[PDB]
Amino acid sequence: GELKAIAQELKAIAYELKAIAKEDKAIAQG
Amino acid sequence: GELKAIAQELKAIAKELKAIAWEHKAIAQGA
Amino acid sequence: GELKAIAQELKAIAYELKAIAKEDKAIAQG
Amino acid sequence: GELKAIAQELKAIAKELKAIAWEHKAIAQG
Amino acid sequence: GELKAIAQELKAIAYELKAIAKEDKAIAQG
Amino acid sequence: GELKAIAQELKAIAKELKAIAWEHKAIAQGA
């Protein structure tokens, strides 16, 4: 279904943000 | 319900942005 | 309702982006 | 209507992102 | 259509993120 | 339909965010 496809894209977005939070903590450490 | 799944992923997104906001404050304030 | 729950999460998201903009402005003006 | 409310929150999100991009352009340049 | 309006706001969001990606690449590329 | 168009735009947003993550990794590690 299209609603599930929307939820799946939001999941993907959540994980790109996890990567960004990871890197930014690295930057705030260095 | 997939509408509830969508709300849940948006909640997750909010949480990550809050983490990012925290690190940006660190950078701003000298950490 | 579930539609309102989605709107509320998008409000939370706007709120956090507002925080990030604030911090990035302080960084940029420093 | 809650669909409208969702559109409005997306508007707010795009607004905050435009501010963030502004600040990052400043960092980039100066 | 309110669904159309949602898609349009999402398109605006993608646009601003594109801008932020360009600026952050510049910040990194030097 | 518009539900598909919405999933479309979300996909594009995830793409942009992936790019951002990579740039930030460069910054984090110098490049």
Helix content percent band of chain A: over 70%
Largest sheet of chain A: none
Strand-residue proportion of chain B = under 5%
How many domains in all of chain A? 1
- Note the overall shape of chain A: rod-shaped
Describe this structure in words.
The complex is a heterohexamer, with three copies of chain A (30 residues) and three copies of chain B. Helices cover 93% and strands 0% of the residues of chain A. By secondary structure, chain A is mainly α. The longest helix of chain A has 28 residues, at 2-29. With 31 residues, chain B is mainly α. Chain B has one domain. Chain B is built from one helix and no strands. Chain B has one helix spanning 2-29. At the D-E interface, helix 1 of D face helix 1 of E.
Name the descriptors.
heterohexamer, A: 30 residues, mainly alpha, B: 31 residues, 0% strand, rod-shaped
Topology diagram in text:
The complex is a heterohexamer, with three copies of chain A (30 residues) and three copies of chain B.
Chain A: H1 2-29
Chain B: H1 2-29
PDB class: de novo protein
Keywords: coiled coil domain, hexamer, KIH interactions, synthetic biology, DE novo protein
Assembly: hexameric
Summary, kept brief:
Chain A is mostly helical. Chain A has one helix and no strands.
